[PDB]
C-alpha cells in the first residue's frame, strides 16, 4: 500500500481509481462497509482502491487540544486500511489544503485532477467544502455523469448506532466487550515495554510488562481487564519463557499517573502462568472483558489475594473468548489452571 | 482624577474633602449610592470627592492566595470611580499602613491629618482598625463635632442583597443577566487579542478574537454567551471589516485551558456577520445573556451546526438588549439576519 | 535503643532475643499489645526486645507511589517503639532482602541466624515469604521446638476493628477524636516552623506558626481543629510569650496548597491568648477534636468573626480534654477566657 | 491600509497593483528603499501599493523554535508599512500555500491571478518556489512582457551592510546607536505595564514602569540604556505627573529572568508616577553600562544617580542631532 | 533575649537602651566590634543592649530575587546576637516602615520614641532615610545633646577588609579558611537530615547524612571540604555509633542539583551511622579538592580514601591551632 | 541466549559454565577479547558461556543521577552479547545483592553456588566485594584449584587505550570515526520515529525521520554527521520510496532541546519518504560540521546541499574501506 502526504505527493500518472473519504478513526464495522464497497468496485474495473483521510483530526483545527481521543493511531489506521485491501492512503491536512474550497472546486481538484476517480463512496453523514456546506446529496448532484456516487447508510445493529462516537463512549465506560462488538475485533494498543516495579519473573506482584501512553490515546477506564499480550516479531532475546508472535493470556491493569502534568495513562500486564520480563520489546495488548474497578491496597497480602482473583476471573473470560474464534488470536497460550 | 499610592503621596496642601471608604470591587449599584452621596456633598462645599480603597485585597493579607476573585481589575476600579465623579483615589496597602492602628488613630491619621475631611460616607458593613474593632457606630461617635458621618444601608432590591459576594455568585453560576442587574451595566473584561486557531475571516469556525486571563479574574462559568465586542480607540490598521469604537454583536465562548498549572481562562469571540482578525488590538467584551453550557464535539459538521444555533440565539437576545438602552452601547452593529 | 538498617548490620554477638514483626504504622493500640507481650517475655529471660519493621512500605515495592499514607514517619515509629520499651529496631528493605525467600529460609535466616530468637510475637494477619504464602499458622508449625510462637488476635473494641486502615479512614474523614481513641493518644505531627502571612504577635488574623508537609503524610481532612502546640526543647530565643516544652491551646487550620504539583498540605496554628512568632523552631501539633469544615471568606471582618468562634469552641473542647488526663499533656497552658 | 491573511482573502476585484515581497523584519533603511520605489511606481499607474510578507518566519517552518529573533512584532511590521504608504499587506503562511510550488507557478498564482501586478520590486537576495530554486534572475526571465521587474541591491552605507541580520547583531551586543542608524529611527518595544517592585512615586529606586517580553522578541543586551518612554493614547487616568503622548526622558534597565522572560524597567527622570495598566512605548537611544550586582542600598542608589547623569547628557545630544528625536518630549537640564 | 517584629511590638515601658543598627549578615569580626562596644556601654548606664536589624534584606525591597546570598539565616543571626550578649533584637521590614521617612523623622521615631536610646553605635558606612540621604555624619549632627553617637571604622586586618561582601567572595571561591578568619569562627549550616543514597552503615560510599538547602543560602563552592558534624541536642535515638553534642570529624561534599538546590553530603570518619531525621550542624574548616566525575566504583573509593587522609591532617591542625576548634570532638589519628 | 535478573532466577540445574564479569558498556574491542576467550573456553569443556553484568550502573548506586552516559542501552548490550555467542546473561543489581559481601563470600555465592563455574575471565582492572577490596589478584588466590582464572590486560592499539571511558570522550567531542575504531563497528542508536517539521516528501528541508532520546543516552556532540539509516524488520507499510532492511545514505543532524532531550534528524539522500511510526536504526560514520544558526531559507538550503556532497564522499570511503560498511545499502554517486 502507498501512503501519500498531501495532493501534491499523489503520482501524476495514476489513471483510474475508486475512492472513499472519512476520518476512519478506529475502522469500525461501519467503516468496513465503505471500504468493502470501494475495494469490490475497484476490482470490477481494474482500478486502485484509495482512502482519503485526515490528519490532524479536523476538529482540532478549529478547536486545538479539544479533539476527540484517537481510537487508533494514524499508523494503525494505515495497517487496518491495508488489511481490508486499500491500495493507497491519501492523507489530507486541513491547515494546508481543501478547507476554504467550494464544494465544486473540491470535487474538481481532489476527485478528478488528483485521483482520476470513476467511483466514490461516502457515508450518509459525510460533509465537505467551506463551512461544511457540501453534503452527501451535494456530492451526488455535483458528480452526475462525471462519476458514480454510492452513499452508504450509517450502521445500526442491536439498537445501537455504530460510530467513532459510540466506540469512544463504550471505551470510556470500561465496556470493552461492546466496543469490540462495534469494532469487529478486540480493541488493542501497541508500544515499547519499559522498566517498572521490580523485575518480571517468579514474583506474582511484579508486572510482566509496563507501558505508557499519551493523553490523546483512547483507552478503557481505569481498572483490570482480561486480554492477550503478544510480543511482536523480533530477533532480540527474550527474558524468560514467552515466545514472540504468540498471544498470551493476561490480566491487564489500566491506570492514570499520580499526579503528573498531561496525565498520562499506564498499562501494566500480568501474564498468566509465565515468568518473564519484556523490557525493550514492542508489545500488543488486546482487551476482551472488564474484570473490576480500581482499588487501593493496604497490605501486600491483601494485594496478592485480589491479584489471584483477577487471574481466576481472567482464565474464565478468556476460555470463553477462544470459543468465539472470529475475534480470538490464531496462536494462543492459555493454561487450563495454575 | 488623581491616583495616590499611600498616605505619604497625598499632597500636603489639600485643604478640604468628602471621603468614602471601601474595597469597591465591581462598583455595583450599592457602591454607586456611597459615591453619589459623596460627590453631591463635595459639590455643596466646593471640596474634592475622595475614594479610599485597598490593594492588595485585604483578605489576601491574612490568607495569601485565598482572596476573592476580582470582579474588576484595579485599573477598571479607577476608571469607574472617575466615571461617577471621584476627584482622587487613595490606594491603601495593609502591609504598609493602617492595619495595627487603633480606631482612634485611624480617624486622626487618615481622615484629618491626611485628607482634611469634613464629611465621610461608609456602608453599614464598614469596619476599620486593629482586629476590625471599629464599626460604623464607632465612626459616628469618634467623629462627633470633628466631622459629619453618613452611614448608608446595604442595598436590597427584588429580595436580593446587592454586594460583591452576590455579584461573584451570579458570575460563577453563569447568570450574567442577574450580575448585570446588580452592577447596573453589562459585565465586561478588557485585554490584548492574541493569535489562536487559524485566522479570523471567511471561515465561521475560526474565532474573530482570542484572549486569555489570569485566575484572579472573575469570569462567567465556562459556556457560550451573547454580548458585544468593541475595539478600543486606536490608529493601528484593522484586518477586515470591523471599525474601532463600535460595539459588534458576538457569540462569546468562555473556557478553561486543559490542563495547565494556574488555569487560566480563555475567551474566544465569534463576531456576527463580520470577517475580521483582531490580533494586536485591545478589545472590550461585554456579556449580556447565557446561551448554553460547554460541550465536546466529535465532527466539524456537528461543531458548525451548533455554532449556527449560537448565532441565532445571540441575534435574538441582543435585539432585546438594545431595547433596554440604559445598558446597551451608544454605537452598535447588529444585522437583522445573516 | 539501637537502630539497624538490614540483617547485615545486626551484631553477630547478640545471643538471645524476643521478636515482633510488622509495619507498625501509627503504633495503634493493637500494635501496643504485640509490643507489650514482647517486652514482658524478654524481661522474663533477660533477653532483648526486638521489633522487625519495614521501610519503604511493602505495598510501594509492588505498586510504586500507590502506598498507604504514613500515619507516622519512620523517625516517629522509632520514638514510639522506644517509649514502649523496645531495645532494638531492625529495618528491612524488601528490595534488598527477604522477599523471594521461602517461608522456611525466612525463619532460618532472620529469626535464628540473625536475631537468635527464643520467642516471636505476631498478629493474626501476619504473612511472610515468597508470594505471601507463609501465614500465622505457618509460623507456628515451622517453629515447633525451635522457638515459641504467640499469635495475637486483632483488636476489636466498641464494634470497630483497630488497624492502620481504620485509623487512616478516621483521619481522612476528619474524625480525629476516633483516631485518637484507636491510637491511645492524640494524633500529632512535628516539623520546622516557616514564614507565612505577616508576623505572629498582636494581630489575631496572623498565624502563630506555619508548617508544610509532603503528600505521603497522613493528616486530618482540610478544616479547623482544637489541639495543643508544643515548642520542642531548644536553647534558641523565642519571639514573644511562649515557653518551650509547654503544650499551648491552639486552633489548628489544615489546608491544601492551591494549586501546586504534588499538593502538599499546610498547617496554620492560632495559639490562644499568646502573641508569638515561632519561625525557626521545631514544633509539635497534637489534634484533639474537629471544629468546622473549610470555608472561603469575602471580607476581613467576616474572617475575624469566624476566627473568634473557632477560639471559643476550642476553649470548650480543650477544657474537656484536660479532664481525660491519660491523653492530655503534663504541662499545659489554657486560659479560662480571653 | 488593508491586511489579508492568505491569497484567498484578497479582493477578487483588484485590477492593478505594484508589489514588494520579503520578510521585512524591522523595516530598516534597506527595506525602506523597496517600499519607496514601490509606493512611487504605484502612484504613476494610479494603482495600490502592496507588501507581500510572511508569518510565521520562513525559517521556523523548516526549523521550529530556532528562528531568528523578531526585530519588531508582526503588529509593528503592519504599522511601519502603513507609515511608509503601503495600501495593502498580504500575509503568506508557508505551511498553507506557495511553499512546494514551482518557480513558474508561484509567479502565475501570486503575482498574476491574485495580485494582478503590473510592477514588482524585490531585493537582490530574493528567492522563491520549491527548494528556493527561483532567484532574483528567475523572476526577470519568467515575467517577460507581462510585468516590469526592478531588482534593488542590498544597502551598504559607511562600509556597513544594512540587513535584518546586522541589526540583530547590533542589538545583541548592546550597540543600540548602530541599530538605530541602520533602522532609520530609535529602536522600540511596546507593551502593557504590570506591577513590580514597590510603587512608582517619590522613591528613586522603584521603577516608573515594569514590562515583560517573550523570548521571541529581540532586545538589547542586558544592561542600562538612555531612552524615551511614551504613554500611548488613552483616556484612562494616570497616577502621578505624566501625560500621554509626551516622550519622557528615562534610564532603562534590561534584564533576564529565566524559567525565558526578558524584563524592561524604566526610571523616568524628574517624575513621580506609576504607570500600571497603561500601554507604554519604550525607545532606546544609547548604551550606558553593563549589568551589575549590588550589596547595599546606598551603593545601588549611588550607581542609579550616575545612570541619571549619563542619560541626561546622551539624551540632550539625541535632541540636538534632531533627525531621530521625538516631536514632543520632556527633558530637564538638571534635577 | 527578646525578638520584636516592627516598632509596634517593642514594649512601651522601655525607658533606656544602647543601640546598634545594621544588616549584620554573618555577624563577622567587624560586626562583633559594634556589638561589643554596645553591650559594654549598656552595662555602664544599667540599660539593655538592642540590635536593630532588617528582614527582608534592604536590597531585595528594590531588587526582588537579586539580593545578596545570606551568610547566615535570620534564625542564626538571632542566636549569634544572643551569644554576644544582646538583650533585644528589633526587626525592621522596609516594606512596612522607616523607608520613605526623612532622615530627621527616622531618628525621632526609631531611636527616640520607640527605643528611648541614650547611646547609639553604627558602622562608618551606615545610611538611612528616604533615598539614603542620611549618612554616618547626618546622625552626629541630628542627635546633638539628646543621645551620644559612636561611629566605628570598618575592620581591616592583615591588609584585608572584613565585611559581608568579602566573606561572600571567600565562600564563593571555596576559601573557607579565609571566610572563617574573617568570621571569627568556623562557617556552618544547620538543617534536618533526609534520605539519600543507600543507608549509612558499614559501606564507605554511602553518606552518613544528606542535606539540601535553598538557593538563598550562601555555601562554599562545589567540592570536598574538611569539617565537623554535630548532632544537635535530642532525646531521639541515633542509628549507629554516634552521640549528640559531640563534634565528629567529617569529609564534606558540596554539590548542586538544578531545576536551585544545593546539597551537602557528609562522610563521618571511622563511624558507621545513619542520621535520617536528626538536626545536624556542619562546620567547614578547609578546602580539600574540586568536584570531579567518576567512571568506576574503584576509582570513586580510591579518591574517597584520599579525601579521608587529607581531612585527617587538616583537622588535626585545626585542633592544635585551638582558637576555632570545638570543645568536645571525636577524631582518630589513623583508621 | 537466556537473560536472568538476579542470582535467584538462574536455573538450579546448571552444572558447568565459563564466565566473564563486567559492566560491558558499549561492548568495545577490549570487551570482545573477554567474550572471545570465554566463548572458546566454554566450547572446550562443552559448557555454556555466561556474561555477568550490572544494572543499574554500579556508580549510580553510590552517586545517583551522576553515572556515566550509556554507550548502549541494556537492550543493546544483550543483543551484542548474543551476537558474539554468549549463552546466558546474568544481570546483577547492587541494591539487591553482592554489594556489601566480603571478597571471599562473593566468589563462593556467585561463581560457585549459582554459576558452577570451572573457568572465569576478567579484565585486569576488575574489582569486587565490600568497599572494592577484592582485585584482579584477590581472584587468583581465592579460587585456587576449584576454578581456572584468566586475567586479560586492557587493550592498547595505535598507542590509544580502548575503554568505555575513551569511547565516551570520542563521542562527546564528535569524533565518531575514533569511537567506531575503538568499538569495532559504526556507533548506532535505535528508536521509534515521531512527527516533526512538515512531512517527509519532495521538500529537502524536511527530515525523513525525527527521533528523541533521554539524557542518559550517549550521543555524538551536536552537529551534522554522515551515516546510514535502516528501517528495522516490519510488515507495516512505508510512506515513500524506501524498503526495510536496507541501509540508506543519510546526513544526520544531532541537536539539543533543554527543559534534557537530545534530537536526531535524518535527511536521507535521494529519497522522498516519511518514516513516522517505524523503528529506525541510525549508524554514525564521520563528522561533517558544527551546529549553526540560519537567518534565511536560501542560506539553510545552501548549507544543506553541502552537507549532502560531504556525506556522499565520506560514505563512498566507508563502503570501500569495507570492514565496517553495511551488507545491504543504497547510495548514489550523484543526484
Author numbering:
A (entry chain A), B (entry chain A), C (entry chain A): 1 to 338
D (entry chain B), E (entry chain B), F (entry chain B): 1 to 259, 263 to 338
Describing publication, verbatim:
Finally, no conformational changes were observed in L6c or in the α1c helix, which contains the E301A mutation, when comparing this mutant’s structure to that of the WT.
The FAD synthetase from Corynebacterium ammoniagenes (CaFADS) is a bifunctional enzyme responsible for the synthesis of flavin mononucleotide (FMN) and flavin adenine dinucleotide (FAD) cofactors. The C-terminal module catalyzes FMN synthesis from riboflavin (RF) (riboflavin kinase, RFK), while the N-terminal one transforms FMN into FAD (FMN:adenylyltransferase, FMNAT). Bioinformatic tools for the exploration of macromolecular interfaces predict that CaFADS might stabilize in hexameric assemblies in solution, organized as dimer of trimers.
